[PDB]
Every structure is written in structure tokens, then in C-alpha cells.
């Protein structure tokens, strides 16, 4: 929820499930997936960022 | 904005013909027509193979598939900066206007469009296939 805070992804279909990423930004306009997370590894599409909801990320 | 009508008297590009054009499906099932207004006379690549010369002003090309028309329209928009209109023509003479459907290109968000196929959940929230057995549905994405 903070800036540049380690979070653990709880989305099961995510490539980075049970992995730790860095929060880039949290949108405050009430969108469905406001937490932007940067990961040190790429997924199968070569993407390093994904958007998650509040319940899908756990601060670590 | 209103859907444009197809003018069948529009001149065709200067083309010597090819073996890649229309087949029996055009006469009995459907075919497609792309129209565009060229700024100048220049050579473009046919989606069915070969080089054709588009005439200055309006142009009309009959193509077998919608994908061929959209590939030609992508070439016209990217290379010649020319917009175009795509129609579907049925053997009875009925003409269905296709692209751009509301006059705005689909990549640009336009008011008055309604979302179809939208699901109010992430893709991991789909149910199990055992939950849709003997229901007649296509799959867990259909419920």
C-alpha cells in the first residue's frame, strides 16, 4: 500500500504468485486493481509489472 | 454521423488481374468491398499479391475476405495516411457496412458503444468444468 514496499502476490493465476515485488504506485480513484507492482523477473510475455487489488497483495 | 452507402460506380485501381482474386464464394456466399479516397495516383501492394496503381480520388476494390480488406486498410492508413470504409456484400445485393462501425476507429474509445463479452471478474475466478456439466453452456467462461 505504501511506496516501494515489498508485497507478496496472492493472485493464483499470476506468474508471480507467492513472489515478492516492489510497489510502484497505488491509484486512489477507486479502480479495481490500483496497486502497481514491479517484479525483478519477467513473465512469459516479457512483462515485469502487473496491477493487483488490495486483497491480492500482502505486505512483507 | 450516419453509415455511408456503397457507390458501385466507383472506379477500381489500375490492376492487370491476378489468380489470387475472387472465387465462387463471392457469387454464392458473400464478398467484401473496401473504398478509399486517394490523395494522388501511386502504387500500392494488393493483399492478394502483386502491385496495383490506385487512382486519384475514390477507389473501389472487391476482396474475398474481411481480413484482406483490413490488411489493405492497415497498409493505406500506415503508408499512405488514407482512411477507408469496408462493406460486406451478399449475393442478393444487400450491402452491410462494417468498418469503422460507428465512424470512429475501434482503437479510439467512442461514446455510445456498449461492452459485450465483459466479465466482472479476473480470469482466475472462473468456475470448474464440473459445475457446467449437463447445462448446455459452452464452458466456464460462458457462466
Amino acid at each position: 500500500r505504501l511506496w516501494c514496499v515489498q508485497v507478496k502476490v496472492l493472485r493464483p493465476e499470476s506468474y508471480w504468485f507467492n513472489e515478492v515485488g516492489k510497489v510502484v504506485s497505488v491509484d486512489q480513484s477507486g479502480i479495481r486493481y490500483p496497486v502497481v507492482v514491479r517484479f525483478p523477473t519477467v513473465n512469459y510475455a516479457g512483462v515485469s509489472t502487473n496491477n493487483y487489488s488490495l486483497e491480492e497483495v500482502q505486505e512483507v | 454521423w450516419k453509415p455511408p452507402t456503397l457507390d458501385p460506380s466507383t472506379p477500381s485501381p489500375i490492376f492487370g488481374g491476378s489468380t489470387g482474386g475472387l472465387l465462387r464464394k463471392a457469387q454464392i456466399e458473400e464478398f467484401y468491398v473496401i473504398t478509399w479516397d486517394a490523395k494522388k495516383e501511386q502504387v500500392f501492394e494488393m493483399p492478394t499479391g502483386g502491385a496495383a496503381i490506385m487512382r486519384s480520388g475514390p477507389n473501389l476494390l472487391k476482396l474475398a475476405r474481411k481480413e484482406q480488406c483490413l490488411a489493405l486498410l492497415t497498409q493505406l492508413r500506415n503508408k499512405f495516411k488514407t482512411d477507408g470504409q469496408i462493406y460486406r456484400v451478399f449475393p442478393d445485393g444487400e450491402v452491410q457496412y462494417l468498418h469503422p462501425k460507428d465512424g470512429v476507429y475501434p482503437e479510439k474509445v467512442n461514446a455510445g458503444r456498449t461492452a459485450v463479452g465483459a466479465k466482472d471478474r479476473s480470469i482466475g475466478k472462473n468456475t470448474n468444468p464440473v459445475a457446467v456439466k449437463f447445462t448446455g453452456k459452452l464452458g466456464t467462461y460462458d457462466v
Partner: protein, 122 residues
């Protein structure tokens, strides 16, 4: 649009194709089948006679080849009959027209086989 060539768009080529029984101006489909069957069923006995398994036996070779040609004609008549029942569910491109065409093919093919046998016997 469509590519036109001297092979596809000659006056001589279109003249030769129009005189074929499949493209003549006014001919009943049974008669078109009759000429097509006569020509084809005359031709098919040749390979059967000259190259069949009994080709080295005098007398039996021509009879066996003509019987094989007649069997091929009957099989092709069956294939034409079941083609028409499926393709049709130009008077030739109709169900009854193709039925008459198949009957004419069978009659002409048997006649051509018999004529080939007579010619080999004379």
C-alpha cells in the same frame, strides 16, 4: 480482377470448348451423357485389354479387358448417380438433369465398351 490468358480467353479455345457435349448450346443432358459415355467407355478398354492380367492370352485378353471397362463404367455411373443426389438437394446442374446425365453416361459407356469389343473382334 480475374487473370485472362490466351489459354483462357482465346476465340479458338472458347470455340473448341463450346463444341464439347458438356458445353453445347442446346443438347439434352441425357444426350450429353451419351456422347461423353461413348467416348470415355471406348477409351478405357484399351489399357485394360493391352495391360491386364490376361493380356498374354489370345481371345481372352479382349473379353477380360472389355468386361473390366464395363465394370469401371458401371462404377463411374454409380459415382455419378450418388453425386447428383448430394450436389442437388442450366438443366444439367439440376437433380433430374444429373439423373438423365448419369443414365446417358451408363448407356453410352456400355455402348462404347461393346463397340470397342466389336472393333477388336473385327
Amino acid at each position: 480482377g480475374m487473370l485472362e490468358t490466351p489459354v483462357t480467353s482465346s476465340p479458338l479455345v472458347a470455340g473448341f470448348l463450346s463444341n464439347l457435349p458438356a458445353y453445347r448450346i442446346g443438347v439434352s443432358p441425357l444426350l450429353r451423357g451419351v456422347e461423353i459415355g461413348l467416348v470415355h467407355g471406348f477409351l478405357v478398354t484399351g489399357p485394360f485389354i493391352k495391360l491386364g492380367p490376361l493380356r498374354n492370352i489370345p481371345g481372352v485378353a479382349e473379353r477380360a479387358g472389355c468386361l473390366s471397362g464395363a465394370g469401371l463404367v458401371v462404377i463411374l455411373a454409380v459415382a455419378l448417380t450418388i453425386y447428383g443426389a448430394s450436389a442437388f438437394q442450366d438443366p444439367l446442374q439440376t437433380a433430374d438433369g444429373w439423373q438423365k446425365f448419369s443414365a446417358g453416361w451408363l448407356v453410352g459407356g456400355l455402348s462404347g465398351v461393346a463397340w470397342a469389343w466389336i472393333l477388336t473382334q473385327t
